[PDB]
Each structure stands twice: as C-alpha cells, then as structure tokens.
Amino acid sequence: MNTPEHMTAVVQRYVAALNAGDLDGIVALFADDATVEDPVGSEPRSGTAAIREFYANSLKLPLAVELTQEVRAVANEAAFAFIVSFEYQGRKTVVAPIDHFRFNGAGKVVSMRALFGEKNIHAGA
Amino acid sequence: MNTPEHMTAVVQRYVAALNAGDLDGIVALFADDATVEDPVGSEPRSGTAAIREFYANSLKLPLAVELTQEVRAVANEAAFAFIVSFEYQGRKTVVAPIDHFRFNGAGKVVSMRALFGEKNIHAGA
C-alpha cells in the first residue's frame, strides 16, 4: 500500500544509500522493469542491470547528498529537492536537482526522473 | 525556443500573477489545450475556460506565494518548490508543493502538475 509515509521512507533510504555508496540498497528500491531518466530529456536506462551500472558510474566519486526540504508525497508519487556534492581536481561541485518517483502497487519505484539543468550545477573555477 | 531562461521567466511570472490575483496573466501562460492536475492524482482540468475557473476559485482568498529554491529547468520542463500561504477564520495555512511544467515549442505551458499531500499542508489549530 503506497502511503505518503512509505514513499517518504523510500526517498530517505535512497538518499542514504547514495551517501553510503550502497549499490544493492539503491537497486533494491526499484521494480525490475523500472526506468531512470537522469537527467530529464536524455534516454532512460531500463531494467535492473542498466540501473545498477548507471549508479555504479555515479558512485565513481564519493557523493554527499542531502534533502533540502520536505518530501512531497501524494498518489503513488513523490518529488524531492536535494543537493549532491563532490570534489574533483580541487573543485567542489554541487548539483541541485528535483527528483520525481512514481511507485507501483508493491510500493517499489517504477520510474525516476531527475530534473536539473546547467543553472543547477554550481561549481567554482 | 525553450531555453532554461524562458522557462524560469515563466515560473516567475506565474508566481507573481498568483500573488497579484491576475487571472489573465496566469491563463496567458498556458497553451489553449493545456491541462492542469492540481493536486497530482485527481482529474485534470482541460482547456482555457476550465483552467481559468480553477484559478478563479483558488483566488477566492488572497494568496501569498513565494519560490523557496532555484527553479530547475531542462528540456522543455521546469520544476519548482514554493509555498502558498493564506488565512481563514483566524488560521494561517501554508501549502508547500513542488510544481512541474512541461512547455511546448511555442514556449507555452502544455501541462501543469502540483504535487503535495497532507504532510505538505501546515496549518495551526
């Protein structure tokens, strides 16, 4: 049963798994036929193996991710604002997206879409 | 041409029109065949006349709306966090949703979805 409480719990488990580099913990949140479109507009990775590799690549560098506002949960859907920070060659970068999950009956994520553009990437020189 | 700058400008014009109770200014932002789903899950109002009435009802009470974070704009889509505040019978209420716009080629809004649930409605007693 998809209650706002469950969907909010899932967003928190997702954010925490990213921080820990827990690939199994992230993949376990998705339906086997789920899709990920990161960022919006590109072509969606489909299925368990594609999704795992995507995150395996994202987690090449250590990410510090945190929710910046309350999670919005309603009718099998959740949206949340957060920031992902990482350093590279002495430069600290902060990506500030808004993600959107859609859950299935079983309470698993069937689709994920990360919305952010160049104006949401904040890196120094 | 839908540039992030245009889409961000539209979100700002939308938020300002709500604050002013400028119904023509809000409706002018949408495509004639646009849809509004407020909140997510319910049934979408379709077309210019339905959309105008919806907002005419929302604007029964004076709304104070403000963007709380940067607007996320990418590939014909924009998402933003904001709060709508209003008073009623001595009670101040704050709704904290995340809206999602999808633009057409002409740069007009073809669809709007407001995502927020009971946990995003913050009223006193």
Nearest to A73 among B70, B72, B119 (CB): B119
Q: How far is residue A66's CA from residue A81's CA, in Å, rounded to a whole number?
A: 9
Give the resolution value in Å. Answer: 2.3
| Integer angstrom CA distances of residue A39 from A20, A34, B41, B115 | 22, 16, 24, 19
Dihedral sign (CA B51, B56, B60, B62): positive
Residues 59-88 of A with CB under 8 A from B: 68-81
Whole-number CA gyration radius for chain B: 14
- For residues A19-43, one letter each, b for 16 or more C-beta atoms within 10 angstroms of the residue's C-beta and e for the rest, the string is eeeebeebbebbbeebbbbbbbeee
Tell me the CA end-to-end span of chain B in Å, nearest whole number.
Answer: 47
Q: What is the DSSP string of A55-119?
A: HHHHTTS--EEEE-S--EEETTEEEEEEEEEEEETTEEEEE--EEEEEE-TTS-EEEEEEE--GG
A99 among annotated binding-site residues:
yes
Closest-CA residue of A relative to B38 is A74
Q: In angstroms, rounded to a whole number, what is the distance separating the alpha carbons of residues A110 and A30?
A: 6
A111 DSSP β-pair partners: A35, A102
Residue A106 phi/psi, 5-degree rounding, is -70, -5
**B23 CB-near residues (< 8 Å, 6+ apart):** B17, B52, B55, B56, B59
d(CA A26, CA A93): 22
Separation CA A87–CA A125 (nearest Å): 12
- Contacts with A70 from chain B: Cβ below 8 Å: 96, 119-120
- Check: CB of residue A119 under 8 Å from CB of residue A96: no
Residues in chain B: 125
Whether B118 and A4 lie within 8 Å, measured CB to CB: yes
Measured between CB atoms, does B4 come within 8 Å of chain A? yes
| Domain boundaries of chain A, sorted by first residue | 1-125
Structure tokens at A116: 């952010």
Please name the helix (run of DSSP H) or strand (run of DSSP E) that holds residue A35, with its range, or none.
strand A30-37
CA angle B31, B33, B35 (to 5 degrees): 90
| Cβ <8 Å between A79 and B98 | yes
* Kind of pairing between the strands at A64-67 and A72-74: unpaired
Structure tokens at B48: 């210019």
Residue matched to tokens 């709060």: B83
Asked if the Cβ–Cβ distance from B100 to A96 is below 8 Å, we say no
Beta strands A30-37 and A109-115 are: parallel
CB-CB: which of A4, A69, A116 is closest to B117? A4
Residues A116, A94: contact at Cβ < 8 Å? no
Using the 8-state DSSP alphabet, how is residue B44 labeled?
P
Query: Six-digit token pair at B102?
Result: 């999808």
Q: Which overall architecture, per CATH, does domain B1-125 show? A: Roll (3.10)
Q: What is the dihedral of CA A74, B112, B73, A18, to 10 degrees?
A: 10
Pick the closest to residue B95 from B82, B80, B76 (CA basis).
B82
Q: Give yes or no for a contact between A45 and A35, defined as CB atoms under 8 angstroms apart.
A: yes
